[PDB]
């Protein structure tokens, strides 16, 4: 009775974990995308300045 | 607002939205070929905002307690308060 | 003397004059252009040839009619210093703007000056303590030192500095200077009022404080030489009066920022981000005129409005170079609700050592750092899989670390207005004992909430009784 | 150092902070109006650094066998090593 | 000498502008010589700016220069010396020795600019170079006349890899080789000079089967750019004029990228992405097309590349990645595991890998090897968390074979008789195919994983099994 519950719990925990990790994946992905844009911009500014001079 | 303020009379001013002023000053500056500041917003943007904001005050008793409350309304970029403006 | 010029251009407050006479003011001279609204003090910064200088204008240019007569007032602007500058709030020019009337100037001193020599250095090590636990444990100060603070300004940042004024300057006997660049006028009015109230400034009788206030309204160029002006007053105390001084600068990001703006106008092609190419030299010169010399060791508190908390922006980075202690203050830790909002892995002092402040202090701090670093390390792991599903040994550590973080929360005296919580200044010797116990889990038998926003260990215990009710 | 090295004496040279040398050359280059390399450090900052570093050596026994050893010290800003310097 | 006399006008770094007289007409890609107490400074003409005022790039240093200085014109691209007397002589950028064996040149000199052979000239070959390095041979078959590329991160024993290749392949090889060093450090240089004297490939008496072109990063970026061009022409002289096949070797071509980026900027040609010159692609193209299998000869370049911060998504390594025939990626992890070579074989792709081309048996074996190792890597996560033993018996046997194979990749190297002390192994291609096939069949799963570690072929594997047993 115990063993079935034990394995059932293991499944449950491991499922919910996949979900929690997914949420965090999404949060850092949006941050990544914004950060990517910022790098492009900072580089772009350097180029603009160079062309300007 | 300052005419009211300088009557000592109490006032309030809401500046909605200075974020759109930033884009405007950006446009003007870029079209004046002034080098892009960070986030492409000019380097004197700090100066602009500070000059605007600091003219709103609760004056001294001599000046008749000239209130002019300031409430500037900022449209946060994606709700990220880390952002230059 | 009357050395004429005309204002050829007014490209911002970076006016260009053409000194008609070939007698050309030298670089770092000062010029008076007479105006119906006062005068303008301008400072020669380039000679662009054909007897056309390009001059920084320390006042807000407007009204200027193209081709305006100039007169050369010569040399670096000479401020007025004295014991009669104590009490005063002085303009960039030096004009007493608190209208305690004209300064009876003994010495009027040039704004530009050179930092003392390597041999002239007198290198201190005398501990200065605040009574702020987090400061004492993690980065204890030293009197005459160079202290540094970073992060968002006036996020209680100003309040933090105010707490320092409240603590340290009500324990400093010497002179003290508050110089606030880009200061918030209302806060300044409050501070001035408070100073007058606490006798620190007393309108009648002496003031052991002098004040320089630079509002952020004032044009960038004025803000650029607010720093130098204050720095001169500091030199008068350091040198001429000899006495050790406190100094507060709030914020020196405004100094850097102002410089980048004018640099472009000057014609200097803007360096990375936008900063002035001369950023390093200017910061260096300034922060070495606050140095510890045989004539005086001046305790400095430097406040950097780190822009969007980009420490990687070179000006905050280069501030670290000119500091012996830093107390980077983190917005995240502010969000965690901790006041003091100090980042605990980003505070340092060279005074922290196993013999400078002793092995016991160092060991306690070492353990705090390690414990917290572990807790931060397991933050991912904890979240994806509960701390229950992490190791038991670690689970004790995690629970302990949560307590330690809360223990670091301590109310403050002039934070009492904002927080509504009576402040606490706890003795350094007491702090070491208190943290030691917590690390040994002696008092880890009581709630995590008990440790939050309280002073000494005894206070935690008492608050346990309070929580129990 | 080379005088020591030349004498056959061994030595060690710490170049701390070489990162600050780069900032200095940046200042010079941009006010010599030289074109800015990436990150505003001129595109020949490498030439300055390379020639400097290659002057630490272990000489041949016909050249004494003197040896200057070098330890450059570079600050990494945010631990960023993808940075040009 | 020549009426073409220019007076320097501006020393603005390496960029030195000259003012040739109105009558005289210089031309782009020429070489100017200015007599100096520092030899003759060579300036490569790169622009005309008007009224016979050129903008030229320096090769040598620009200290002490006096603006107004008379400038002779060589009259065209820098002229090196060529011959079969170039063998075993270090040739600097302008051609002058560093080996100090006096006048290098046979009876000829040649210009260092030359054109890449046309489509008509190109002659295809499917010939297979053999490295004698078993892992390299099997999982990345090399090709004679190819453009092998040693892509890797920071100094992955880049020189060491090349040294092993020279130790095995060069001695075996009957043609010539050219070792070209672009900005390589003089410690490494001294080791290489010594090392190839030791391996006798620089045969002190008699002909050397290698030639040397050592460039030092100390030398200004301009010299760094045209050391590559110099080396390239030497290989062409061998390929064409001597008719022989060669094995070109260049080191490190990221240094070539960096150099080109710098002088692009200096030329005022605003550097493109990640500060890398806008002309990067076409410059790469000229070098790369110049290296090929013609009907005059065949040249197998092995070019080292430094991949900054192991980011090959960076445009400069990525651009080079396309142009090269036979890529290999050296990985730190595998190095740390102690395996020499450090190549991650699942990160190595050679153009020759086509099934019949490498032979059906070889191909089938190589598909199986790739799967076996890949199985170990995929399963590594499972072995790690879930545990080793929870996996299938079949999976476990594949893992055991993979661990044996993994350490059967470990070939102790002859040039790592100083980096490990343990001698080399020169294993024939056929022998490698056979020995790897055997392992896969599981015939030597009774031989420990560590009895494959740091030993050669099957004979050695058995011998070390016996050795450990004893």
Curated annotation (Swiss-Prot), chain A:
Lineage: superkingdom: Eukaryota
Substitution effect: residue 17 to V: Lower activity
Subcellular location per the Swiss-Prot or TrEMBL entry: Mitochondrion; Mitochondrion inner membrane
Additional free-text comment from the UniProt record: Present with 28100 molecules/cell in log phase SD medium.
Family that this chain belongs to: Belongs to the ATPase gamma chain family.
Oligomeric form and interacting partners: F-type ATPases have 2 components, CF(1) - the catalytic core - and CF(0) - the membrane proton channel. CF(1) has five subunits: alpha(3), beta(3), gamma(1), delta(1), epsilon(1). CF(0) has three main subunits: a, b and c.
Function comment: Mitochondrial membrane ATP synthase (F(1)F(0) ATP synthase or Complex V) produces ATP from ADP in the presence of a proton gradient across the membrane which is generated by electron transport complexes of the respiratory chain. F-type ATPases consist of two structural domains, F(1) - containing the extramembraneous catalytic core, and F(0) - containing the membrane proton channel, linked together by a central stalk and a peripheral stalk. During catalysis, ATP synthesis in the catalytic domain of F(1) is coupled via a rotary mechanism of the central stalk subunits to proton translocation.
Name this protein carries in UniProt: ATP synthase subunit gamma, mitochondrial
Organism this protein belongs to: Saccharomyces cerevisiae (strain ATCC 204508 / S288c)
Taxonomic path: Eukaryota, Fungi, Dikarya, Ascomycota, Saccharomycotina
Gene (UniProt): ATP3
Covered residues, full protein: 257 to 309 of 311
From Swiss-Prot, chains B, D:
Lineage top rank: taxon: Eukaryota
Compartments where found: Mitochondrion inner membrane
Disulfide pairings: none
Signal peptide: none
Other notes: Present with 41500 molecules/cell in log phase SD medium.
Quaternary structure note: F-type ATPases have 2 components, CF(1) - the catalytic core - and CF(0) - the membrane proton channel. CF(1) has five subunits: alpha(3), beta(3), gamma(1), delta(1), epsilon(1). CF(0) has three main subunits: a, b and c.
Family: Belongs to the ATPase alpha/beta chains family.
Function of the protein: Mitochondrial membrane ATP synthase (F(1)F(0) ATP synthase or Complex V) produces ATP from ADP in the presence of a proton gradient across the membrane which is generated by electron transport complexes of the respiratory chain. F-type ATPases consist of two structural domains, F(1) - containing the extramembraneous catalytic core, and F(0) - containing the membrane proton channel, linked together by a central stalk and a peripheral stalk. During catalysis, ATP synthesis in the catalytic domain of F(1) is coupled via a rotary mechanism of the central stalk subunits to proton translocation.
Listed name of the protein: ATP synthase subunit alpha, mitochondrial
Natural source organism: Saccharomyces cerevisiae (strain ATCC 204508 / S288c) (Baker's yeast)
Residues of the full protein shown: 291 to 375 of 545
From Swiss-Prot, chain C:
Any further remark recorded for this protein: Present with 164000 molecules/cell in log phase SD medium.
InterPro entries in the cross-refs: AAA+_ATPase, ATP-synt_VA_C, ATP_synth_F1_bsu, ATPase_a/bsu_AS, ATPase_alpha/beta_chains, ATPase_F1/V1/A1_a/bsu_N, ATPase_F1/V1/A1_a/bsu_N_sf, ATPase_F1/V1/A1_a/bsu_nucl-bd
Cross-referenced Gene3D superfamilies: 2.40.10.170, Bovine Mitochondrial F1-atpase, Atp Synthase Beta Chain, Chain D, domain 3, P-loop containing nucleotide triphosphate hydrolases
Entry function: Mitochondrial membrane ATP synthase (F(1)F(0) ATP synthase or Complex V) produces ATP from ADP in the presence of a proton gradient across the membrane which is generated by electron transport complexes of the respiratory chain. F-type ATPases consist of two structural domains, F(1) - containing the extramembraneous catalytic core, and F(0) - containing the membrane proton channel, linked together by a central stalk and a peripheral stalk. During catalysis, ATP synthesis in the catalytic domain of F(1) is coupled via a rotary mechanism of the central stalk subunits to proton translocation.
Biological process (GO), any one: proton motive force-driven ATP synthesis
PTM-bearing positions, type Phosphothreonine: 73, 198
Organism: Saccharomyces cerevisiae (strain ATCC 204508 / S288c)
EC class (word): translocase
Keyword rRNA processing appears in the UniProt entry: no
Record-given protein name: ATP synthase subunit beta, mitochondrial
Gene: ATP2
Principal place of residence: mitochondrion
Residues annotated as binding ATP: 151-158
Its EC number(s): 7.1.2.2
PTM annotation (Phosphoserine): residues: 334
Assigned protein family: Belongs to the ATPase alpha/beta chains family.
UniProtKB/Swiss-Prot annotation, chain E:
Source species, domain of life: Eukaryota
Catalytic activity: ATP + H2O + 4 H(+)(in) = ADP + phosphate + 5 H(+)(out)
Top EC class, one word: translocase
Signal sequence residues: none
SMART domains with a match to the protein in the record: AAA (SM00382)
Subcellular location: Mitochondrion; Mitochondrion inner membrane
Keywords: ATP synthesis, ATP-binding, CF(1), Hydrogen ion transport, Ion transport, Membrane, Mitochondrion, Mitochondrion inner membrane, Nucleotide-binding, Phosphoprotein, Transit peptide, Translocase, Transport
Predominant subcellular localization, coarse grouping: mitochondrion
GO biological process, one term: proton motive force-driven ATP synthesis
Pfam families in UniProt: ATP-synt_ab (PF00006), ATP-synt_ab_N (PF02874), ATP-synt_VA_C (PF22919)
Biological role: Mitochondrial membrane ATP synthase (F(1)F(0) ATP synthase or Complex V) produces ATP from ADP in the presence of a proton gradient across the membrane which is generated by electron transport complexes of the respiratory chain. F-type ATPases consist of two structural domains, F(1) - containing the extramembraneous catalytic core, and F(0) - containing the membrane proton channel, linked together by a central stalk and a peripheral stalk. During catalysis, ATP synthesis in the catalytic domain of F(1) is coupled via a rotary mechanism of the central stalk subunits to proton translocation.
Miscellaneous remark of the record: Present with 164000 molecules/cell in log phase SD medium.
Annotated protein name in UniProt: ATP synthase subunit beta, mitochondrial
């Amino acid at each position: 009775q115990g063993y079935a519950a034990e394995i059932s719990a293991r499944r449950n925990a491991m499922d919910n974990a996949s979900k929690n990790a997914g949420d965090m994946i999404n949060r850092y992905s949006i941050l990544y995308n914004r950060t990517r844009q910022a790098v492009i911009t900072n580089e772009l500014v350097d180029i603009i300045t160079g062309a300007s001079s | 607002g300052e005419w009211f303020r300088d009557n000592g009379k109490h006032a309030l001013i809401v500046y909605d939205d200075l974020s759109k002023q930033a884009v405007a000053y950006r446009q003007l500056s870029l079209l004046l070929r002034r080098p892009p500041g960070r986030e492409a917003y000019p380097g004197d943007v700090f100066y602009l905002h500070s000059r605007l904001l600091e003219r709103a005050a609760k004056l001294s008793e001599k000046e008749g307690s000239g209130s002019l409350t300031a409430l500037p309304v900022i449209e946060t970029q994606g709700g990220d308060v880390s952002a230059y403006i | 003397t009357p050395i004429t010029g005309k204002v050829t251009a007014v490209i911002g407050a970076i006016v260009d004059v053409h000194f008609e006479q070939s007698e050309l003011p030298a670089i770092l001279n000062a010029l008076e252009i007479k105006t119906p609204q006062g005068k303008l003090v301008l400072e020669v910064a380039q000679h662009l040839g054909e007897n056309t200088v390009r001059t920084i204008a320390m006042d807000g240019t407007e009204g200027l009619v193209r081709g305006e007569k100039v007169l050369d007032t010569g040399g670096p602007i000479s401020v007025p210093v004295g014991r009669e500058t104590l009490g005063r709030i002085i303009n960039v020019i030096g004009e007493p703007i608190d209208e305690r009337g004209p300064i009876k100037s003994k010495l009027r001193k040039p704004i530009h000056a050179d930092p003392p020599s390597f041999a002239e250095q007198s290198t201190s090590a005398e501990i200065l303590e605040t009574g702020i636990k987090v400061v004492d444990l993690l980065a204890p100060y030293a009197r005459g030192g160079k202290i540094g603070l970073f992060g968002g300004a006036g996020v209680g940042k100003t309040v933090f500095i105010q707490e320092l004024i409240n603590n340290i300057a009500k324990a400093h006997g010497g002179f003290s200077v508050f110089t606030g660049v880009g200061e918030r006028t209302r806060e300044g009015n409050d501070l001035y009022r408070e100073m007058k109230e606490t006798g620190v400034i007393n309108l009648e009788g002496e003031s052991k404080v002098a004040l320089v206030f630079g509002q952020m309204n004032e044009p960038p160029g004025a803000r650029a030489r607010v720093a130098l002006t204050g720095l001169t007053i500091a030199e008068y105390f350091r040198d001429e009066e000899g006495q050790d001084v406190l100094l507060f600068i709030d914020n020196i990001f405004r100094f850097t920022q102002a410089g980048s703006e004018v640099s472009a106008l000057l014609g200097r092609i803007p360096s990375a981000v936008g900063y002035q190419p001369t950023l390093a030299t200017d910061m260096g010169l300034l922060q070495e005129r606050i140095t510890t010399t045989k004539k005086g060791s001046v305790t400095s508190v430097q406040a950097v409005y780190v822009p969007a908390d980009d420490l990687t922006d070179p000006a905050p980075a280069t501030t670290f170079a000119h500091l012996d202690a830093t107390t980077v203050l983190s917005r995240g830790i502010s969000e965690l609700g901790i006041y003091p909002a100090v980042d605990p892995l980003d505070s340092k002092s060279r005074l922290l050592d196993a013999a400078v402040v002793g092995q016991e202090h160092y060991d306690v701090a070492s353990k705090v750092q390690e414990t917290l670093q572990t807790y931060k390390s397991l933050q991912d792991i904890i979240a994806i899989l509960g701390m229950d599903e992490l190791s038991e040994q670690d689970k004790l550590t995690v629970e302990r670390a949560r307590k330690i973080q809360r223990f670091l929360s301590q109310p403050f005296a002039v934070a009492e207005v904002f927080t509504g919580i009576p402040g606490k200044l706890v003795r350094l010797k007491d702090t070491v004992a208190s943290f030691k116990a917590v690390l040994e889990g002696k008092y880890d038998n009581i709630p995590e909430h008990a440790f939050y926003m309280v002073g000494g260990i005894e206070d935690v215990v008492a608050k346990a009784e309070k929580l129990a009710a």
